[PDB]
């Protein structure tokens, strides 16, 4: 009588960008052919989007199937993430699932509902990473593992899969410290990316004109918030001193403090590498080139651009590793594999990096699902999803779709589209963003909106600034329409249904607050 519960494998990494994904002949700046196998087996979700651009409250949307407001984990705080609260994982626990988790977390608090948990103090490192896990009596320890962050976590995440009791179906997140700042390649990928022949954005150079006024607050330019020797890897000891002001952005000149994790051997090998870079650096302010306020920005951006996209290759190098483990072990139409990044990313639109905007780059998050004989191979889908509807797809996968577990979501099942590469006939036709971080690092607003098939609507609270795109005239978001008479009715219509949401989804009054208020707390309800 019992059916089958088939395993859950959810990839997650950090800050990858959908147009890095890899997954066809327009995201792939650098080819990965291990992110397009998996495409080719399974389903792309080119609506994906998140409903709180940061690291720390996309993971608890995702684990709660509910918007920050009501998880309660707004920001990247030190207001630790409620754990006793309904999360997935322990649901699927309850329901009879080995669950484990290695790598980010970042939420404060221990991890509940995992059997194995092994994870970051926080950020993570790319060279010999730290890990934190309990002893049997309970106590917390701290253990450093030589190697590189993305193969480490790959190497326990298999460990772990080849040491598990195979008779329960398992849970197993694999969080990945990349492709987040501060990009740092594998020493094997060291000169394996060539950004020369790759062009900025059409839109690297914006002035922020017809936009509200808070976008030139931005502190996320790749031109002006970049850390020359720590994000973008320059040596200092090889630049001539009297040229040192003339490169650093103030307040931006920072250690890279990778280079005091590495083995001497290590550090020689990343800094032979990084004297062609710095030798350019150098000789293009000495010819004066680079004294071009614009072309310095546009070196910047190849530097950040070859960096991340060299992380890129190991996290394609992982997820290989762990499709051959799921391939050889007989277990692959059993397995439904997610693989998302925590949300997007900007590769230099509007002249930025980071996300934390309702701009299309960074509401967007990539997704991309595999179940063999359940989800159509090689299909991209339109449909509109989010990160809070992971939750109740995954325990719907899972068969502990009870009354009581599924009452907790705000998000919905995915199944419907994932089984049919369609958008059901009803399905949602807005979804919510909120973002609390402010004050607070890059100095995005707070402020919150919908997202339609067509439409963003966003209402800046930092700022008291409406804003309105029109995605179908002005994809790439240059262009504020909410004063705009062609659109009157629209936007008369769309606030209206920006309040329905925050009504439907229980957003209180205030929330998320101007200036004139601290970043607000919640208790977690369900
Ligand atoms: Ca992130």
């Given at each position: 009588?019992?059916?089958?519960?088939?395993?859950?494998?959810?990839?997650?990494?950090?800050?990858?960008?959908?147009?890095?994904?890899?997954?066809?002949?327009?995201?792939?700046?650098?080819?990965?052919?291990?992110?397009?196998?998996?495409?080719?087996?399974?389903?792309?979700?080119?609506?994906?989007?998140?409903?709180?651009?940061?690291?720390?409250?996309?993971?608890?949307?995702?684990?709660?199937?509910?918007?920050?407001?009501?998880?309660?984990?707004?920001?990247?705080?030190?207001?630790?993430?409620?754990?006793?609260?309904?999360?997935?994982?322990?649901?699927?626990?309850?329901?009879?699932?080995?669950?484990?988790?290695?790598?980010?977390w970042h939420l404060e608090s221990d991890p509940?509902?995992?059997?194995?948990?092994?994870?970051?103090?926080?950020?993570?490192?790319?060279?010999?990473?730290?890990?934190?896990?309990?002893?049997?009596?309970?106590?917390?320890?701290?253990?450093?593992?030589?190697?590189?962050?993305?193969?480490?976590?790959?190497?326990?995440?298999?460990?772990?899969?080849?040491?598990?009791?195979?008779?329960?179906?398992?849970?197993?997140?694999?969080?990945?410290?990349?492709?987040?700042?501060?990009?740092?390649?594998?020493?094997?990928?060291?000169?394996?990316?060539?950004?020369?022949?790759?062009?900025?954005?059409?839109?690297?150079?914006?002035?922020?004109?017809?936009?509200?006024?808070?976008?030139?607050?931005?502190?996320?330019?790749?031109?002006?918030?970049?850390?020359?020797?720590?994000?973008?890897?320059?040596?200092?000891?090889?630049?001539?001193?009297?040229?040192?002001?003339?490169?650093?952005?103030?307040?931006?000149?920072?250690?890279?403090?990778?280079?005091?994790?590495?083995?001497?051997?290590?550090?020689?090998?990343?800094?032979?590498?990084?004297?062609?870079?710095?030798?350019?650096?150098?000789?293009?302010?000495?010819?004066?080139?680079?004294?071009?306020?614009?072309?310095?920005?546009?070196?910047?951006?190849?530097?950040?651009?070859?960096?991340?996209?060299?992380?890129?290759?190991?996290?394609?190098?992982?997820?290989?590793?762990?499709?051959?483990?799921?391939?050889?072990?007989?277990?692959?139409?059993?397995?439904?594999?997610?693989?998302?990044?925590?949300?997007?990313?900007?590769?230099?639109?509007?002249?930025?990096?980071?996300?934390?905007?309702?701009?299309?780059?960074?509401?967007?998050?990539?997704?991309?699902?595999?179940?063999?004989?359940?989800?159509?191979?090689?299909?991209?889908?339109?449909?509109?999803?989010?990160?809070?509807?992971?939750?109740?797809?995954?325990?719907?996968?899972?068969?502990?779709?009870?009354?009581?577990?599924?009452?907790?979501?705000?998000?919905?099942?995915?199944?419907?589209?994932?089984?049919?590469?369609?958008?059901?006939?009803?399905?949602?036709?807005?979804?919510?963003?909120?973002?609390?971080?402010?004050?607070?690092?890059?100095?995005?607003?707070?402020?919150?909106?919908?997202?339609?098939?067509?439409?963003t609507l966003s209402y800046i609270w930092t700022?008291?600034?409406?804003?309105?795109?029109?995605?179908?005239?002005?994809?790439?978001?240059?262009?504020?329409?909410?004063?705009?008479?062609?659109?009157?009715?629209?936007?008369?219509?769309?606030?209206?249904?920006?309040?329905?949401?925050?009504?439907?989804?229980?957003?209180?009054?205030?929330?998320?607050?101007?200036?004139?208020?601290?970043?607000?707390?919640?208790?977690?309800?369900?």
């Amino acid at each position: 009588e019992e059916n089958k519960k088939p395993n859950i494998l959810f990839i997650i990494t950090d800050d990858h960008a959908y147009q890095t994904l890899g997954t066809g002949n327009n995201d792939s700046p650098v080819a990965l052919p291990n992110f397009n196998k998996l495409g080719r087996q399974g389903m792309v979700f080119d609506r994906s989007y998140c409903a709180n651009s940061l690291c720390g409250p996309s993971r608890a949307c995702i684990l709660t199937g509910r918007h920050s407001h009501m998880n309660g984990f707004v920001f990247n705080g030190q207001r630790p993430l409620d754990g006793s609260q309904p999360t997935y994982p322990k649901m699927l626990q309850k329901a009879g699932y080995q669950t484990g988790l290695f790598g980010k977390w970042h939420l404060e608090s221990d991890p509940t509902g995992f059997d194995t948990w092994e994870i970051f103090p926080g950020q993570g490192s790319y060279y010999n990473p730290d890990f934190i896990s309990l002893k049997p009596d309970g106590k917390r320890q701290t253990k450093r593992f030589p190697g590189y962050a993305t193969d480490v976590v790959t190497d326990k995440s298999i460990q772990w899969l080849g040491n598990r009791d195979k008779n329960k179906p398992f849970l197993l997140v694999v969080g990945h410290k990349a492709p987040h700042r501060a990009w740092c390649p594998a020493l094997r990928h060291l000169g394996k990316v060539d950004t020369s022949s790759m062009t900025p954005p059409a839109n690297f150079h914006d002035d922020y004109a017809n936009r509200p006024e808070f976008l030139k607050k931005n502190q996320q330019t790749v031109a002006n918030h970049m850390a020359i020797y720590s994000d973008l890897k320059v040596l200092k000891d090889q630049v001539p001193e009297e040229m040192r002001k003339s490169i650093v952005s103030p307040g931006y000149g920072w250690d890279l403090g990778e280079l005091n994790r590495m083995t001497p051997e290590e550090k020689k090998t990343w800094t032979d590498y990084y004297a062609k870079r710095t030798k350019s650096l150098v000789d293009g302010m000495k010819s004066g080139k680079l004294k071009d306020p614009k072309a310095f920005a546009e070196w910047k951006w190849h530097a950040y651009m070859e960096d991340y996209l060299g992380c890129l290759l190991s996290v394609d190098d992982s997820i290989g590793r762990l499709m051959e483990y799921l391939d050889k072990e007989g277990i692959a139409k059993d397995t439904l594999v997610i693989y998302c990044g925590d949300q997007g990313f900007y590769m230099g639109e509007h002249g930025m990096y980071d996300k934390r905007w309702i701009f299309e780059e960074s509401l967007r998050m990539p997704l991309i699902m595999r179940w063999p004989g359940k989800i159509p191979a090689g299909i991209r889908n339109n449909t509109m999803v989010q990160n809070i509807d992971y939750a109740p797809t995954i325990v719907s996968a899972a068969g502990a779709d009870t009354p009581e577990n599924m009452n907790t979501f705000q998000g919905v099942s995915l199944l419907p589209t994932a089984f049919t590469g369609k958008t059901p006939d009803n399905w949602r036709d807005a979804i919510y963003y909120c973002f609390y971080e402010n004050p607070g690092e890059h100095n995005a607003p707070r402020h919150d909106g919908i997202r339609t098939d067509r439409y963003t609507l966003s209402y800046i609270w930092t700022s008291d600034e409406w804003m309105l795109f029109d995605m179908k005239k002005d994809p790439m978001q240059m262009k504020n329409v909410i004063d705009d008479p062609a659109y009157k009715t629209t936007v008369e219509q769309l606030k209206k249904r920006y309040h329905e949401l925050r009504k439907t989804y229980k957003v209180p009054e205030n929330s998320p607050g101007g200036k004139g208020t601290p970043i607000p707390k919640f208790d977690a309800s369900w």
